[PDB]
Design a protein around this ligand. Structure first.
Ligand SMILES: [Mg+2]
Ligand SMILES: [Mg+2]
Ligand SMILES: [Mg+2]
Ligand SMILES: [Mg+2]
Ligand SMILES: [Mg+2]
Ligand SMILES: [Mg+2]
Ligand SMILES: [Mg+2]
Ligand SMILES: [Mg+2]
Ligand SMILES: [Mg+2]
Ligand SMILES: [Mg+2]
Ligand SMILES: [Mg+2]
Ligand SMILES: [Mg+2]
Lengths: 394, 107, 63, 131
RNA sequence: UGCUUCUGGGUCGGGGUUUCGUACGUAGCAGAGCAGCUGCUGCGAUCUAUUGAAAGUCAGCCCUCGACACAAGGGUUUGU
RNA sequence: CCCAUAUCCGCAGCAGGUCUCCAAGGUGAACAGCCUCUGGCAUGUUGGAACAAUGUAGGUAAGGGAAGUCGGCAAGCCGG
């Protein structure tokens, strides 16, 4: 017969083939549509999930019950050292899709990016591009290059640029960089292309891509959780206590005469390590890396107009399981996908943000730099020493 | 150069963290025997019965957190086997593991 | 932003951390974590507990 | 103007909260919450500031054996505020009310959460404390 | 993911952090008292000082550039 | 000689069944439970590595307290 009482479906069919993601680095499945009006710019970047923390900002939204009242609000730090452009790549629009038409790489390439090619950097002779490099220093090659540029100008429609990360500037373990095609959006192809040509072998900080209070998307792989049963995977009901063949199951997996079992039934399998895009995350703050000047370094990133201290975002004891954020970083509102030390892809929004919640300007009053390695109760080591006083170890 | 001895210390508390109760002192011996296999590239390891008794000193569930040990590489005795050098592992009673470095003890 | 002070220990509570207990007769107390909150609900005396602030103050320790 | 934010509701249908006003009622058996659509096998659940339908289990007999409106003024479950605080009270308590909001009683014994004072004026008037 | 840019990770140590709550010893004319010897000396739970002490802390925490050794290697295949 | 988680009967070195004798210290009312000495054994027809689901046997859960279910089944409270 029919289902007695109505209940909505358990879990979405729009993320259906819940398998281990086929890629570790998040992939921009779609870039924002370009208008030849806007000046030449980039559309995506690449950062690493450091950790989360509080934020005390003044809320401005006329009509809401928290108008001009300080609210505590979680954020997430994504460390983002500048990316190094190491090549461009053009596409043609064909009636069968968008075929890649030609790639061109810069003369010099870091060993960081060259690690991305070899599955074993220890047994290798490190020969990648060793013969390609000899095209940038002779007329026989320089000519061909200029040809391969005037061709992409004549034919290519979309221009992407290849830009790897800088993996030595991070507190991680892996030295092998992450590559990615960031699509240049802007003017005509000729001006889009003689732009990246100037930026070959150059660095692109995040200020050149993202601003403040800018809603962006985050693309990355969910944190993996292994072979989980159906109660954890699909969050189905738990059978009552008197069930014989175990209770964390689905009792009925199909009617009789649809004599298969269907693709919309909740069944056990891999949970986590999926590829998700999460949209409308606001950039609260594009902080700045450490830097020496006059011998003394300036580390105060977490100091605001109201706090006026000398503390960096680095909590007491460093971010847990990640390390020390000593580079540029973005502060996204709320959680993001992935685990710590995971490479997230930050993409410009695909929509036209016209909303008071999207166009709100942000002014942080206080950033929370206590420790996350337990219930830490002190903002700075100085404040801790000046509170506890002198100990025995002195 | 080939017959050398030197004292180490082994943070069993971290080489054992996670294993179940009834298999702690055992995993601590398998981890001593593997530690000496790393610090001295010899597959033959020989754990002295004083170091054994000192690992099972408290019990099976409460293995000491650290342990001071004296790895001594020696020439294989009679019955020349595929191995040429074996590693004798020896206990070293210690009152505190504070500022205890790896010492290159000598004869 | 106003920083409170744990009613049991005496440490400084920052905007994000801790809780508030409101007894049936007013008398709101702020707590830093569930160690303070539990030593309060257990009706312990902050002056007989070495790590609190009322203890260091009573026994005049420090300075 | 300002709208009630959501709080960690912690009073399933069946909760016996004590009656914190002088109507002679001692208890309030919550029988359903106002404004809840529902879901398969999910008890309704009231929080601070939520009007509910209740029932006096012990108290003056002219109030027993009938359904009453009520407003939860104090809940024991820790609810968060937008200003980054987690508040909770020593007991669960609510007051009796008519469908338009006026208190059936006169006074309120104990505090009244600001999530209930921002929302019900005729309870904030008879309030003793706030938050 | 790492596996010789005199570097690289690994172990140990140190520092940061953090959890619990003030270690053993010793001192005390603090201690309900009790006993012996003519004030002294013993027994005595607890207390105070040394003592936010002691203990643990990456095995899936963070920094060392402190000692120690190590790492240029092995095996199987692949052709337009 | 065995007299029973291997010498008997259950097809077997089978968690079943099968008649008696003697009977230490502590705690405690106690031949109760728990640790120990005399005496005995090597985990009950195997080991190693992992620590997924679903199980089996134990646990603990904020707020509510039978709203669950045919039914307070199970668990829990109580306990000297
Ligand atoms: Mg229907
Ligand atoms: Mg059954
Ligand atoms: Mg933490
Ligand atoms: Mg139902
Ligand atoms: Mg067994
Ligand atoms: Mg047997
Ligand atoms: Mg066996
Ligand atoms: Mg419960
Ligand atoms: Mg509870
Ligand atoms: Mg019923
Ligand atoms: Mg029912
Ligand atoms: Mg029963």
């Amino acid at each position: 017969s029919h289902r007695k009482f109505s209940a909505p479906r358990h879990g979405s069919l729009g993320f259906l083939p819940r398998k281990r993601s086929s890629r570790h680095r998040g992939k921009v499945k779609s870039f924002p549509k370009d208008d030849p009006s806007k000046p030449v710019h980039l559309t995506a970047f690449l950062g690493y999930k450091a950790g989360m923390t509080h934020i005390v900002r003044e809320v401005d939204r006329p009509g809401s019950k928290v108008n001009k009242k300080e609210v505590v609000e979680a954020v997430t730090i994504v460390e983002t050292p500048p990316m190094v452009v190491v090549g461009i790549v053009g596409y043609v629009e064909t009636p069968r899709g968008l075929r890649t038409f030609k790639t061109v790489f810069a003369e010099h390439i870091s060993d960081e990016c060259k690690r991305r090619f070899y599955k074993n950097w220890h047994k290798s002779k490190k020969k990648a591009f060793t013969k390609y490099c000899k095209k940038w220093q002779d007329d026989a090659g320089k000519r061909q290059l200029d040809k391969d540029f005037s061709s992409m100008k004549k034919y290519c429609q979309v221009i992407r640029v290849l830009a790897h990360t800088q993996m030595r500037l991070l507190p991680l373990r892996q030295k092998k960089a992450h590559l990615m095609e960031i699509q240049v959006n802007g003017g005509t192809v000729a001006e889009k292309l003689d732009w990246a040509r100037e930026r070959l072998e150059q660095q692109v900080p995040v200020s050149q891509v993202f601003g403040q209070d800018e809603m962006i998307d985050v693309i990355g792989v969910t944190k993996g959780k292994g072979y989980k049963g159906v109660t954890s995977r699909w969050h189905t009901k738990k059978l009552p206590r008197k069930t014989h063949r175990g209770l964390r199951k689905v009792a009925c997996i199909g009617a009789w005469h649809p004599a298969r079992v269907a693709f919309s039934v909740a069944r056990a399998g891999q949970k986590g390590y999926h590829h998700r895009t999460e949209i409308n995350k606001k950039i609260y703050k594009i902080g700045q890396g450490y830097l020496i000047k006059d011998g003394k370094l300036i580390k105060n990133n977490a100091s605001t107009d109201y706090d006026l201290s000398d503390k960096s975002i680095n909590p007491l004891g460093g971010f847990v399981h990640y390390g020390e954020v000593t580079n540029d970083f973005v502060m996204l509102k709320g959680c993001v996908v992935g685990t710590k030390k995971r490479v997230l892809t930050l993409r410009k929004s695909l929509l036209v943000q016209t909303k008071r919640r999207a166009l709100e300007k942000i002014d942080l009053k206080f950033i929370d730099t206590t420790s996350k390695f337990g219930h830490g109760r002190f903002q700075t080591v100085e404040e801790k020493k000046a509170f506890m006083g002198p100990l025995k170890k002195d | 150069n080939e017959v050398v001895t030197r004292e180490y210390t082994i943070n069993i508390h971290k080489r054992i963290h996670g294993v179940g109760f009834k298999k702690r002192a055992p995993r601590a011996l398998k981890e001593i025997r593997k530690f000496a296999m790393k610090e001295m590239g010899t597959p033959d390891v020989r754990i002295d019965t004083r170091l054994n008794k000192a690992v099972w000193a408290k019990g099976i569930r409460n293995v000491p957190y650290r342990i001071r040990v004296r790895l001594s590489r020696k020439r294989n005795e009679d019955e020349d086997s595929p191995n040429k050098l074996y590693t004798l592992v020896t206990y070293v009673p210690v009152t505190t593991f504070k500022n205890l470095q790896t010492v290159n003890v000598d004869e | 932003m106003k920083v409170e002070l744990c009613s049991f220990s005496g440490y400084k509570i920052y905007p994000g951390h801790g809780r508030r207990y409101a007894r049936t007769d007013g008398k709101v107390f702020q707590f830093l974590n569930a160690k303070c909150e539990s030593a309060f609900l257990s009706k312990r005396n902050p002056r007989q507990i070495n790590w609190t602030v009322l203890y260091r103050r009573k026994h005049k320790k420090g300075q | 103007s300002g709208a009630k934010f959501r709080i960690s509701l912690g009073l399933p249908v069946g909760a016996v909260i004590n009656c914190a006003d002088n109507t002679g009622a001692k208890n309030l058996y919550i029988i359903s919450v106002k404004g809840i659509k529902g879901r398969l096998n999910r008890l309704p659940a009231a929080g601070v500031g939520d009007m509910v339908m209740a029932t006096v289990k012990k108290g003056k007999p002219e109030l027993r054996k009938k359904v009453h409106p009520a407003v939860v003024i104090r809940q024991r479950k820790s609810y968060r505020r937008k200003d980054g605080v987690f508040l909770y009270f020593e007991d669960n308590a609510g007051v009796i009310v008519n469908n338009k909001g006026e208190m059936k009683g006169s006074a309120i014994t104990g505090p009244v959460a600001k999530e209930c004072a921002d929302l019900w004026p005729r309870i904030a008037s008879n309030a003793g404390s706030i938050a």
